[PDB]
Each structure stands twice: as structure tokens, then as C-alpha cells.
Ligand binder design. Structure first.
Ligand SMILES: [Zn+2]
Ligand SMILES: [Zn+2]
Length: 230
């Protein structure tokens, strides 16, 4: 069905050089909750977007990469300071992988009980990452859409593909809720969702943390649900 099982994780090829990783964590009350990130081969190296929930799961992502790609992981970028995105930082660091996050995510990480990334991204007024803070990002195009799911949430397009990654900002076109709103910015969410869409206008495959890949209707639907929060 395209879902490759490797240990307790699932890997799904999305494009020639792009795979989605999925890991699970029990939330007594919501069952075994999936979180998705990305793996991108860029020539002779690999780039990761988001950890798994835990170090052990994140080490399994690295093991899958060694088996299935067998190229060095040059860097990882993590998309905000929550456990699903940054819970496995130590595994990346033990593996010698350079890590990047929004400056604000690195500031938040220790209070969230998370390990900060080694490097901080900062963003221009137009939302786009300041390029000098994202060296060697290859095809990864990093965009801060504004506060939404969290204050620090960032998003990533993959050049050479039709894919844009909304992380925990974007939910699928049939979602019934915006999920965990504990740290959300209810006033700016809708605008932040639409800004993500406007940043990646040619992206036809929208990848997200807590749903399978969807069409751009994910963006419009998410923005319309968020319209209610104000
Ligand atoms: Zn989150
Ligand atoms: Zn999440």
C-alpha cells in the first residue's frame, strides 16, 4: 500500500528522492498517535525533517536510512518544540548530525523538556528563512508562516518536487479538528495557514504531521477551521 514497515515505524516513498517517516506514541485517551516527518536524498547526502517522538524511534529512522539509502545524513531541521518533532534530538546528536530549528524553538526546547538543536534559523519579514542561517539546505525551502499551531512552527518545501510540508500547522481536508491547540495562536492561525499555501503555490502534495499526504484542499480546509478560532 506503499507503507514500508521497519521495526515499529512506517516509511512511505512520496517522490523519487522523498520519503515520509511515521512513528507512534500512546496518548492514554487518544490511542497510538502517529507523527510524520520527511527524509530527502539530495545527491550523495540525506536530509531529515523532524525527529520521531523518542530517541529510540529516531535511531530507527537512521537505521532505515542506512539500509535503504546508505548515504550520510548531512543535517536535520525540526519544525517546532514539541515532542513529536524534537523528541529524538539526542539520537541525531549521537549520530553526529547537524541540527537546525527556529531560534524560538531552541529557546523553548529546554522548558518543554526537549534538547535544543545545535543551530538557529531566523526569518525575514516576508517569512522566508534568512538564507545565511540555513547553510547547505539544498532543496529544502524553509518558511515561517506566522504563529498558528504553535508560536514557533515552521514549514518546508522540497524543490524539484510537488511537495510542501506543513508539519503540525496543516490538517487534512476531512479533519474534524485542529488537534492539539494547547500552545496555539488562535488569532493568527488562519492567516498563518493561508500564508503557507501562498508560500508554496505550486505544491500539489501537502504533507503534514498527523494525516496522510493530501491535496491543497488541506490548506483551504485548515484555514477555514482556523477562521473559527478568532
Ligand atoms: Zn506540535
Ligand atoms: Zn503534533
Amino acid at each position: 500500500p506503499g507503507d514500508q514497515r521497519f521495526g515499529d515505524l512506517v516509511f512511505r516513498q512520496l517522490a523519487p528522492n522523498v520519503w515520509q517517516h511515521t512513528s507512534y506514541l500512546d496518548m492514554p485517551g487518544f490511542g497510538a498517535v502517529a507523527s510524520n516527518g520527511l527524509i530527502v536524498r539530495d545527491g550523495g547526502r540525506v536530509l531529515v525533517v523532524d525527529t520521531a517522538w523518542t530517541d529510540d524511534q529516531t535511531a530507527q529512522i537512521l537505521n532505515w536510512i542506512k539500509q535503504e539509502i546508505n548515504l550520510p545524513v548531512a543535517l536535520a531541521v525540526v519544525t517546532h518544540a514539541h515532542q513529536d518533532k524534537m523528541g529524538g534530538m539526542d539520537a541525531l546528536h549521537a549520530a553526529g548530525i547537524a541540527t537546525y530549528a527556529n531560534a524560538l524553538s531552541n529557546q523553548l526546547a529546554p522548558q518543554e523538556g526537549l534538547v535544543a538543536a545545535q543551530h538557529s534559523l531566523t526569518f525575514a519579514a516576508n517569512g522566508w528563512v534568512e538564507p545565511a542561517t540555513a547553510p547547505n539546505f539544498g532543496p529544502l525551502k524553509v518558511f515561517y508562516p506566522g504563529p498558528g499551531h504553535t508560536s514557533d512552527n515552521i514549514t518546508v518545501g522540497i524543490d524539484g518536487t510537488d511537495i510542501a510540508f506543513g508539519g503540525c500547522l496543516i490538517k487534512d481536508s476531512k479533519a474534524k479538528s485542529l488537534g492539539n491547540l494547547g500552545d496555539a495562536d488562535t488569532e493568527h492561525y488562519a492567516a498563518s495557514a493561508r500564508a503557507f499555501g501562498a508560500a508554496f503555490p505550486k505544491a500539489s502534495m501537502i504533507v503534514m504531521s498527523h494525516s496522510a499526504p493530501d491535496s491543497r484542499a488541506a490548506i483551504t480546509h485548515t484555514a477555514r477551521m482556523a477562521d473559527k478560532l478568532r
